[PDB]
Amino acid sequence: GTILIDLSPDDKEFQSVEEEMQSTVREHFNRYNILKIQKVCNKKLWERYTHRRKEVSEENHNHANERMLFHGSPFVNAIIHKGFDERHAYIGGMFGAGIYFAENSSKSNQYVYGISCYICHRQLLFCRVTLGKSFLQMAHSPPGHHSVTGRPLALAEYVIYRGEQAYPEYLITYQIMRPE
Numbered sequence: 568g569t570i571l572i573d574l575s576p577d578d579k580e581f582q583s584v585e586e587e588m589q590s591t592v593r594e595h596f597n598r599y600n601i602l603k604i605q606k607v608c609n610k611k612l613w614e615r616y617t618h619r620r621k622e623v624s625e626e627n628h629n630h631a632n633e634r635m636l637f638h639g640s641p642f643v644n645a646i647i648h649k650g651f652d653e654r655h656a657y658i659g660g661m662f663g664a665g666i667y668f669a670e671n672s673s674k675s676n677q678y679v680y681g682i683s684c685y686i687c688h689r690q691l692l693f694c695r696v697t698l699g700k701s702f703l704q705m706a707h708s709p710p711g712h713h714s715v716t717g718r719p720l721a722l723a724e725y726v727i728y729r730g731e732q733a734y735p736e737y738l739i740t741y742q743i744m745r746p747e
Contacts, residue, residue: 569648571738572606580606584693584737587635592673595720596743599672602688603740612650612734616695619731623699623713631697632713636668636725637675638692638735646692647738651730662715663705665726666733668696674722676743685745693737698725 574581584604592598624631640646642655656664669675672691679689699713707728708714715726727733 568611569607569609571647572608574604574606576601584739587693588637588672588691588739588741591637591671593671593720593722595673596685597746598744600742600744601739602742603738605738605740607647607735607738609648609650615650615731616697616734619729620697623697623732627699627713630699632699632701634668634670634696634698634725635736636670636694636696637672638666638668638694638733639675639678640667641679641681643679643690643692643735643738646735651694651727651733651735653728653730656728660726661719662717662724662726663728665705665715665728666730668694668725668727668733670723670725674724685743687742689741689743691739691741692735693739695734695736696725696727697732698727699732701725 581604585601620631651666675691701714701716702709702712704715704717717724
């Protein structure tokens, strides 16, 4: 029961997600061509998220440690309908078998087509992620912990090992803009 709410570029919510998308771009293109920012409204994927959010709160001194983070994966189209699913994690990842996020849109943009075209439209997710007690760096969370924060330039990555601790709130259809 997923319904996509298309946001007007004149809407404060659109501009918020637009600036957050554009301002978090670093260099390893310069700016993005933001085409479509849609809200993801699924009552069951939401009640599943919030239920888990409260579980983590009670295990972390009444602090969910919630963050808005970007996500890229070949599974975006499936995620918005079936929710995040740790079962589809990669066994050999640097931080084990978890779902990867980043606070830089440009980081998540790397993982859109698995692990240089200006024409083909891309999609990222801008998600609510419950980090809870994040371990600074494997199969699951370490004991007493709910997420992994990594920092391998030195760009921050965040990994969860339970699909229900993230909700794909915004679907951003965009292109990387050609440097003039």
